[PDB]
């Protein structure tokens, strides 16, 4: 190809074939002109050494070059590896009908939607837009509709909002480690230029919102839409593929709001009255007559689905708080209130959400998750949950704890100053005195944070769980648990040298206060190690997943039951004393290999190829079973695949 003016792009192969053909022209000449052996052995060497270049330049002694020692890319350099066809153009390739933008958070989306800019939708869906303007007969054909789109005329949006009206679009970040990293959403149009993503789903992508771009793809055919809607739509993927654990796990602000809504404060406005239901609980809150975390009694009703699966509705007085009454209004009618009757936090609400999925199923769960999100945002707003430096709490015992520990370290030093302790022992004991100070500072600081709240119970003071701003965030599990708050206001503690060996004199300061220059300079030996690790690791992790999919990709589940009776045995992992995992982690949802007996003898408990779903694993936990034999894909005697029963539960379903 020509480039900038009358110059051909140096198009490597044509320099290699040029080498060959020149040499061959000479060799035909010198053969027919009958040169002596030494001359033809010259040209014959130079020809063999040139065809060497053309095939796989650089397996020779040295690669040949035509610039500042750039080796020319030969054929075999075009086939292989990271810039060659197999990886660069075949296995994955660039695609039309795609676009990208910076993502930004859209709180108002229902979980299945994402907003995408009108400019992109109009530049992406063009073929479908022509397929409406001809169908309106409003444009004569492509030749006119093209112009009618270019002019961006007033009709086109009402057409676009009919084209798109339910065409799923696929959003994926990159890298995309796992299936949840491409998902489909129904688009809704936006005026701006960012892609408005749903808040809960950002966690799945590991999409942070700090300027993290994301690509979008339109699926074109009917089949690509039916696959997108049935499989990849975000509503169908509330669980992880890898472990039976939600991926909708609540966003930090949502859980902050729900924690704040459900606390009890022992003094409050409107405390102690009795109400006929959530609705007048809300009227009581919204008019400002009762505080949200005030204690109350309410009439409640709750629903249970019986042994058949049909609802029994029940009603009672409940003793609770205004905000637990309001929150009960969001829960779908089939869960027990005992799941809400407690000050909620990130673990407690994940199990809340999980139990919704356990009891109702998917379709209520996605909507309940949406409502949780909206609720948490709204009460987190009213909560005004700011952060402020007067809210960093230093336990003044910290001053004494250092002033004590410093002298005891100097006792280890004075022995050393008398030769009375060894050079190893002096060090490895001093760092334990600093550990004994550090545990004490941390414990005093967590006690002080809980200690900061005490209030008059109409007469005489009494204590309660601390409304201290940073402590709400830790105690809720929103962000920054013990290891962070310990550094913010307790002490930063011991630090490590480049070779991992521990510093003899720790950072007894904390970030509420200043580090001096040395404490700061040593602090960076931590952090720069942790960043070097990130930037170094991100290669080897990827080369690991490549090697794995590129060995696993041959498997597909391909029979129902291979017909084995063989398998392997599961127990709690008992080691180092106590059990590091229970049986219910391992065995849940495999199929039994062999008939599982009652603990004891001759009474069978589970038939010999039964899926041990949850009601079976709770039953095993009712028994004194320790070892269970189950089928495993390593033992499944299907040729060229695996049988379904040997694989067992599909974790995402």
């Amino acid at each position: 190809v020509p480039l900038d003016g009358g110059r051909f792009a140096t198009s490597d192969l044509n320099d290699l074939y040029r080498r060959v053909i020149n040499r061959n022209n000479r060799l035909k000449r010198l053969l027919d002109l009958a040169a002596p052996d030494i001359i033809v052995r010259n040209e014959k060497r130079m020809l063999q050494e040139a065809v060497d270049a053309l095939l796989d330049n650089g397996r020779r002694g040295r690669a040949i070059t035509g610039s500042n020692k750039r080796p020319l890319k030969s054929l075999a350099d075009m086939i292989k590896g990271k810039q060659g066809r197999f990886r660069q153009n075949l296995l994955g390739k660039r695609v039309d009908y795609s676009g990208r933008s910076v993502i930004t958070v859209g709180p108002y989306l229902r979980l299945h939607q994402c907003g995408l800019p009108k400019k992109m939708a109009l530049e992406l869906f063009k073929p479908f837009i022509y397929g409406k303007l001809e169908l309106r007969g409003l444009a004569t054909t492509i030749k006119a509709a093209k112009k009618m789109v270019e002019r961006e005329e007033a009709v086109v949006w009402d057409i676009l909002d009919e084209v798109i009206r339910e065409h799923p679009v696929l959003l994926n970040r990159a890298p995309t480690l796992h299936r949840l990293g491409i998902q489909a959403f129904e688009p809704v149009l936006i005026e701006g230029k960012a892609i408005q993503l749903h808040p809960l789903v950002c966690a799945a992508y590991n999409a942070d919102f700090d300027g993290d771009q994301m690509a979008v793809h339109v699926p074109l055919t009917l089949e690509a839409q039916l696959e997108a809607r049935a499989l990849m739509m975000s509503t169908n993927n509330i669980l992880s593929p890898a472990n039976g654990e939600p991926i909708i796990v609540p966003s930090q602000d949502v859980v902050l709001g729900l924690y704040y809504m459900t606390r009890d404060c022992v003094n409050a406005k409107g405390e102690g009255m009795v109400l006929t239901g959530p609705k007048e609980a809300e009227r009581l809150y919204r008019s400002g007559l009762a505080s949200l975390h005030a204690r109350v009694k309410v009439r409640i009703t709750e629903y249970e689905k019986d042994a058949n699966g049909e609802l029994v509705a029940k009603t009672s007085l409940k003793d609770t708080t205004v905000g637990r009454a309001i929150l009960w209004m969001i829960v779908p009618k089939g869960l027990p209130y005992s799941i809400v009757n407690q000050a909620l936090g990130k673990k407690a609400i994940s199990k809340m959400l999980n139990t919704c999925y356990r009891i109702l199923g998917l379709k209520p769960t996605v909507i309940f998750a949406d409502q949780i999100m909206y609720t948490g945002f709204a009460y987190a707003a009213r909560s005004g949950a700011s952060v402020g430096i007067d809210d960093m709490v230093i336990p003044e015992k910290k001053h004494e704890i250092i002033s004590e520990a410093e002298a005891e370290v100097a006792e280890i030093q004075e022995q050393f100053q008398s030769g009375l302790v060894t050079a190893g022992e002096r060090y490895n004991k001093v760092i334990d005195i600093w550990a004994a100070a550090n545990d004490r500072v941390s414990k005093a600081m967590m006690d002080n944070l809980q200690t900061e709240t005490v209030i008059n119970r109409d007469g005489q003071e009494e204590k309660q769980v601390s409304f201290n701003s940073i402590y709400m965030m830790a105690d809720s599990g929103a962000r920054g648990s013990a290891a962070q708050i310990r550094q913010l206001a307790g002490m930063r503690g011991l630090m490590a040298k480049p070779d991992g060996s521990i510093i003899e004199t720790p950072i007894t300061a904390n970030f509420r206060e200043g580090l001096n220059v040395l404490q700061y300079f040593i602090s960076t030996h931590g952090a720069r190690k942790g960043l070097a690790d990130t930037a170094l690791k991100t290669a080897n992790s990827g080369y690991l997943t490549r090697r794995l999919v590129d060995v696993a990709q041959d498997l597909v589940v391909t029979e129902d039951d291979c017909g084995t009776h063989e398998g392997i045995m599961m127990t709690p992992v008992i080691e180092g004393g106590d059990v590091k995992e229970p049986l219910r982690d391992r065995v849940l949802g495999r199929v039994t290999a062999e008939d599982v007996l009652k603990p004891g003898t001759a009474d069978i408990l589970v038939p010999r190829n039964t899926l041990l779903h949850e009601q079976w694993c709770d039953l095993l936990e009712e028994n004194s079973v320790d070892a269970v034999k189950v089928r495993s894909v390593v033992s499944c005697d299907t040729d060229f695949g695996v049988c379904a029963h040997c694989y067992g539960r599909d974790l995402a379903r």
């Binding site: 003016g5 695609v95 039309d96 530049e123 992406l124 771009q213 707003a381 909560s383 965030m473």
Partner: protein, 1320 residues
């Protein structure tokens, strides 16, 4: 106390406490004094071009038997100055001219010349020059050479565990690294046999070198090993005991004599026994024959009588051998002492590997191991071996390498030759063997005493050497064969190889970086980067934790925070604020001398290996105003260890609390509080802020802005003191005062400011005045702001009023919520200037034209072109507008159209034309401009001298010799024709009218030369006829998706542009401008951002009291009282300031700049205590909790509990969204395989890359995948059938088989590999 006239306009209230004894060095002396060190000639020939010339000249051929020799060099002034050069697009360079003298000798005679011909300065090349901003201009583009940091020349000893063999033991290695030439490695084999190699070639037995130097083995053994002797007298074979050779080891055998036995069999030996051994004088002793039967002999033993061998040096003895050789009369038999701990036998072991006999057989082995396939040959071998280590053409420890070598061998002196010598290698071997004998230490590799900085003035001296090295090879031959009769030096050399060498360097080297001219900080922190990469360095892909990590010698030399996280952490570092390059290139940094017990205010720079010899107190350490330490014991660092030591034990002290950081981090306030992750991301995000439209000042800073904005050279700085004569936002012109004038000059310094222009990153850079007409200015005052500055403080961003709280989730996770009030104010709008160019050529079908007569297009488009064929200035343009109506013969409308998507106002055009080619009225329009701009500024001197000279007529008329019957109405040289007599005054008149004519003739050549600069065309590339460049300015606003960041490494997209009524507002009804999320502060431990907010809030409060005191018409004496009460606030803060001396005028002029918040300094590790922020907030009428109750503008409800409100500083980053939003329906495809193009600069499709395909396969989704990688992508049929089915709305595909896979088949079948598709 005094402040300069640009300080005394916004005296930043300073909270610092430590008195800054050393004021920050000019932040680019790293670069400028490197290049000055290259460009200056220096008779002490090291450093500079002159050193390189003297590295090659004199130059000669033996067969020519004549020479040419360098005498001296001159460097002419650069053909175009920087401003004009940056327009015209060439490189700013200087012509290199060299006095070469060619000397012609004769045969037979003494060498006295037949002739010698000094060529009058042969032209040698064009070396670029550095601009005073420290940047090179290389093709109009402005480029910066980052300093390299790499392993200094020297000798280095090393060892490792597990990386080698892993059986618990460690292997030791020594290297000699020259500056130029071959590396030599010595290393032991595991079995302690010693080996050597050159340049990581094959392993050789190490004595092969000592052989090659023609030591015999007997001599080698006298170089390395201690003697033990046997004397065959008083009884057969007595033995020479040196007592100290037995200690700690077991006396496993009979040694005794004469009285008390020292130590009998089986017992250790100790001091008291050695003293008894000495007191008995054990000079000879009895030992059993097993002892002598252990020995290896020192020296050669032929039988003299037969003349024939019985034993040889390092041959091993036995009783029968000892008998026959002492029986042969060799009554002194001599051997070596080799205790396994202290005297291991490694060289004898090496002589058991050794295949060599003597010198020649080793040279044979050398030449065959090094040059396999060439013949060894006695006359030929040395022409390898000497050029490995002993010849200047190929081995060279520079003066730094020799110094480091000598220091490591513990030599007395460091003025030494650059080549090795026998004893220079032997000393390395001995030191390596001492290490293996356990009596020494290995060096830490990654220590800033072993790695040295190379900067531009050294990289370019090497590349210029590569030049002279290729001229060497040409000129030697041309001289050797030449007749010497007609040749003159300009025949002998030609510039082309030098120019190739240096131009490729400055143009394209891995270190000639294109400058990040993003904002004035990013200019500087780039000019002072330290890079480990590039030529002679390591590589970003090929290093690990050993070098990325920080090291204890970094303190004060390299900033630990400011490194570009990502694939090259710590392979790039930023040279710390105060640090400096030593003479040799090692990084050295200033410390205060602690003299006995007082901190003396004198600074000594310490390199990284001077530092370990002292104990140095941390910068915070207090003093008593005499200067004794206040503390009785104090924290110091010492040997990388740190601990507490006594008062008056300590020996040096840090110079400043800023010493540990770079400017990039030194600008963060309250850095004392931040996690070093978030310090790092802060100090990296500051260098990306784009200059906003109306930039001002950070309210909380560090007082480093007053230095970054000035030293970065981008504010225009007053070269000499004077008074402002005129200002108009394009020119500023200063009547310099006569106390700093040069006597013949007009005395007037213009400053033509640069206006709207593209930065290298497309942000605009318009300088604006800060002065007023008639205002006085002093040398070094800022006259004009740069981009991102105001009043000469750095000012990247805008001091936006932020409150920390959740808001319905719009600021979830990280996002920033923003009020419409900020965008309405044009707070963050920013101007992006693109350059588009239309080239035109003398193509093969014929020459192009620029015209409006374009074929196939009507006035519907052409309405914006003028009649010449270029767009009007001030045309506002959009996609597809024709900017330049180029056309090609045989007529084709190829014309410059504005690319898709972009839009803007055409702010300027430029036109460039070859020689011998016609202009047009847009070239004449530009000539009219530039001529007039030169002529005006010249006239404003000629006018000033004319006025002075006519005064110099008038005054000496009017004062005496008056002729003023009529005077001032007349032409003031027609004043000569008045009738004054031939007394001296008429001769003064005649002479000073001739001085007036010559004053006209003076400018009569100066303006001609200037107009000749403008009249000419330009040095176009071959093929082009002319080029025109057209600039589009876009005023981009701010919108969802744009990125903003704080200084603390907090960052977000802005997520919604909320209308004012929805912002929270306070109990006074002012809404907040931004709502940040709180949870990021504990979760990422960057709580310094809260104290910036509170101190920012107080900063607003003082302006709030001042603005009220200016709306109310308070008298200055009350106003001065409040301002003074603000500056004196706090503890014993460093600064003192007396508004009593500000003359009221300047008190109002000060107030008029505080009236939007008092600016504050919080120097990095020395900031305000909390108790001083509270104190300032109490001086304002503000709530000292810092928090305020807020209400929600959606309802007017109160928020529960107050929330933080205050003035953070926020930067718009250059990652703004419309520069990234992209989408493609269909368009281009690549040629080799039909997959879509990739880009925004091309209308590309996103890569559905490898990992996404596994992601689809992991759903069941097969049809989606089939589509994505065929129909949507590659199948040349199917995509056009798909497109039509979609416009038909059929929703069906025909999938085929991708053409990229057919490419593969042919690319395999283009090997002799028959791959084929198969049927069943």
């Amino acid at each position: 106390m005094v402040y300069s006239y640009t300080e005394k306009k916004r005296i930043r209230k300073d909270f610092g406490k430590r008195p800054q004894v050393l004021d920050v060095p000019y932040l680019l002396s790293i670069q400028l004094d490197s290049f000055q060190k290259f460009i200056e000639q220096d008779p002490e020939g090291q450093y500079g071009l002159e050193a390189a010339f003297r590295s090659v000249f004199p130059i000669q051929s033996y067969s020519g038997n004549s020479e040419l020799q360098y005498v001296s060099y001159r460097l002419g002034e650069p053909v175009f100055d920087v401003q004009e050069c940056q327009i015209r697009g060439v490189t700013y360079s200087a012509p290199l001219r060299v006095k070469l003298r060619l000397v012609i000798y004769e045969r037979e005679a003494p060498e006295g010349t037949v002739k010698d011909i000094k060529e009058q300065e042969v032209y040698m090349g064009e070396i670029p020059l550095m601009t005073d901003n420290g940047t090179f201009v290389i093709n109009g583009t402005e480029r910066v050479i980052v300093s390299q940091l790499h392993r200094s020349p020297g000798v280095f000893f090393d060892s490792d565990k597990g990386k080698t063999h892993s059986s618990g033991k460690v292997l030791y290695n020594a290297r000699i690294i020259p500056y130029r030439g071959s590396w030599l490695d010595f290393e032991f084999d595991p079995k302690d046999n010693l080996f050597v190699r050159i340049d990581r070639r094959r392993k050789l037995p190490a004595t092969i070198i000592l052989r090659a130097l023609n030591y015999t083995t007997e001599q080698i053994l006298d170089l390395f090993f201690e003697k033990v002797i046997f004397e065959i007298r008083d009884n057969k074979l007595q033995m020479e005991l040196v007592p100290e050779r037995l200690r700690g080891e077991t006396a496993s055998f009979d040694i005794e004599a004469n009285g008390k036995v020292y130590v009998e069999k089986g017992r250790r030996i100790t001091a008291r026994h050695i003293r008894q051994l000495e007191k008995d004088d054990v000079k000879l002793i009895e030992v059993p024959v097993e002892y002598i039967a252990g020995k290896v002999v020192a020296k050669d033993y032929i039988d003299e009588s037969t003349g024939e061998l019985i034993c040889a040096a390092n041959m091993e003895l036995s009783l029968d051998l000892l008998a026959k050789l002492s029986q042969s009369g060799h009554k002194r038999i001599e051997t070596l002492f080799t205790n396994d701990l202290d005297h291991g036998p490694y060289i004898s072991e090496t002589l058991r590997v050794d295949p060599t006999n003597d010198r020649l057989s080793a040279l044979v082995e050398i030449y065959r191991m090094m040059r396999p396939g060439e013949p060894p040959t006695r006359e030929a071998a040395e022409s390898l071996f000497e050029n490995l280590f002993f010849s200047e053409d190929r081995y060279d420890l520079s003066a730094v390498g020799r110094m480091k070598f000598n220091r490591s061998l513990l030599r007395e002196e460091i003025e030494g030759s650059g080549i090795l010598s026998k004893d220079d290698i032997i000393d390395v071997m001995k030191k390596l063997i001492d290490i293996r004998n356990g009596k020494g230490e290995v060096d830490d590799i990654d220590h800033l005493g072993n790695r040295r900085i190379r900067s531009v003035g050294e990289m370019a001296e090497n590349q210029f050497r590569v030049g002279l090295v290729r001229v060497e090879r040409a000129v030697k031959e041309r001289l050797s064969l030449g007749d010497l009769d007609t040749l003159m030096p300009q025949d002998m050399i030609n510039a082309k190889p030098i120019s190739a060498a240096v131009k490729e360097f400055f143009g394209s080297s891995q270190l000639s970086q294109f400058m990040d001219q993003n904002n004035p900080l990013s200019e500087i922190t780039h000019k002072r980067r330290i890079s480990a990469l590039g030529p002679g360095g390591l590589t970003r892909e090929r290093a690990g934790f050993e070098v990325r990590d920080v090291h204890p010698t970094h303190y004060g030399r390299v900033c630990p925070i400011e490194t570009p996280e990502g694939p090259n952490i710590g392979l790039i570092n930023s040279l710390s604020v105060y640090a400096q390059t030593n003479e040799y290139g090692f990084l050295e940094t200033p410390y205060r001398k602690v003299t006995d017990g007082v901190v003396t205010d004198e600074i000594h720079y310490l390199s990284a290996i001077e530092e370990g010899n002292y104990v140095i107190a941390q910068a915070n350490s207090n003093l008593d105003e005499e200067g004794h330490f206040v503390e009785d014991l104090v924290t110091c660092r010492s040997k990388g260890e740190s601990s507490l030591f006594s008062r008056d034990q300590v020996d040096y002290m840090d110079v400043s609390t800023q010493q540990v950081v770079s400017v990039g981090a030194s600008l963060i306030p309250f850095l004392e509080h931040d996690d070093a992750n978030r310090a790092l991301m802060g100090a990296n995000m500051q260098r990306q802020a784009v200059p906003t439209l109306r930039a001002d000042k950070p309210l909380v800073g560090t007082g480093m802005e007053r230095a970054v904005a000035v030293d970065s050279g981008v504010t225009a700085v007053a070269k000499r003191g004077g008074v402002v004569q005129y200002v108009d936002a394009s020119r500023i012109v200063i009547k310099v005062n006569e106390d700093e004038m040069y006597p013949g000059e007009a005395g007037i310094d213009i400053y033509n400011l640069t206006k709207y222009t593209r930065s290298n990153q497309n942000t605009c850079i318009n300088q604006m005045p800060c002065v007023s007409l008639g205002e006085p200015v002093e040398r070094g005052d800022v006259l004009a702001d740069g981009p991102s500055t105001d009043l000469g403080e750095l000012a990247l961003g805008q001091n936006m009023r932020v409150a920390f709280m959740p808001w319905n989730g719009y600021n979830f996770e990280d996002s920033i919520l923003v009020s419409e009030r900020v965008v309405q104010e044009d707070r963050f709008t920013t101007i992006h200037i693109q350059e588009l160019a239309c080239v035109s050529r003398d193509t093969k079908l014929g020459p192009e034209e620029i015209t409006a007569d374009i074929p196939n297009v009507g006035e519907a488009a052409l309405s914006k072109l003028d009649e010449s064929g270029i767009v009007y200035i001030g045309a506002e343009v959009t996609g597809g507008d024709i900017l330049v109506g180029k056309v090609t013969p045989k007529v084709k409308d190829s014309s410059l159209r504005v690319p898709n998507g972009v839009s803007g106002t055409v702010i300027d055009v430029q036109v460039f034309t070859r020689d011998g080619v016609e202009k047009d009225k847009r070239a004449l329009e530009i000539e009219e401009m530039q001529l007039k701009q030169a002529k005006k500024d010249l006239s404003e001197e000629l006018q000033i001298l004319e006025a002075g000279l006519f005064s110099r007529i008038r005054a000496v008329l009017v004062a005496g010799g008056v002729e003023a019957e009529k005077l001032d109405k007349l032409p003031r040289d027609r004043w000569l024709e008045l009738g004054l007599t031939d007394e001296e005054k008429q001769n003064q008149l005649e002479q000073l009218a001739e001085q007036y004519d010559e004053l006209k003739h003076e400018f009569e050549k100066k303006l001609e030369a200037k107009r000749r600069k403008i009249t000419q065309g330009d040095d176009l590339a071959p093929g082009v006829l002319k080029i025109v460049k057209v600039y589009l300015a876009v005023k981009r606003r701010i919108q969802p998706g744009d990125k903003m960041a704080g200084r603390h490494g907090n960052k977000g997209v802005i997520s919604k542009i909320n209308p004012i009524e929805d912002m929270p507002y306070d109990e006074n009804g002012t809404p907040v401008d931004i709502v940040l999320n709180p949870l990021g502060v504990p979760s990422r431990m960057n709580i310094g951002q809260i104290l910036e907010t509170h101190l920012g809030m107080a900063a607003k409060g003082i302006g709030d009291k001042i603005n009220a005191m200016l709306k109310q018409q308070q008298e200055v004496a009350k106003l001065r009282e409040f301002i003074q009460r603000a500056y004196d606030l706090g503890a014993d803060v460093r600064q003192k300031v007396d508004l009593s001396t500000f003359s009221d005028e300047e008190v109002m002029r000060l107030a008029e700049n505080l009236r939007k918040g008092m600016p504050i300094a919080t120097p990095v590790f020395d900031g305000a205590k909390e108790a001083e922020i509270k104190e300032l907030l109490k001086l304002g009428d503000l709530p000292t909790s810092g928090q305020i109750r807020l209400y929600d503008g959606r309802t007017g409800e109160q928020f529960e509990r107050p929330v933080t409100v205050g003035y953070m500083y926020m930067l718009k980053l250059n990652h703004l969204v419309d520069d990234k939003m992209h989408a493609r329906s269909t368009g281009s495809y690549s040629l080799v395989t039909q997959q879509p193009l990739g880009g925004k600069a091309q209308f590309g499709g996103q890569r559905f890359g490898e990992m996404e395909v596994w992601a689809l396969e992991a759903y069941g989704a097969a049809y989606t995948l089939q589509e994505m990688l065929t129909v949507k992508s590659d199948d040349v049929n199917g995509r056009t059938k798909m497109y039509k089915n979609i416009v038909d709305g059929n929703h069906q595909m025909e999938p085929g088989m991708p053409e990229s896979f057919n490419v593969l088949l042919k690319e395999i079948r283009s090997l002799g590999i028959n791959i084929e598709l198969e049927d069943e």
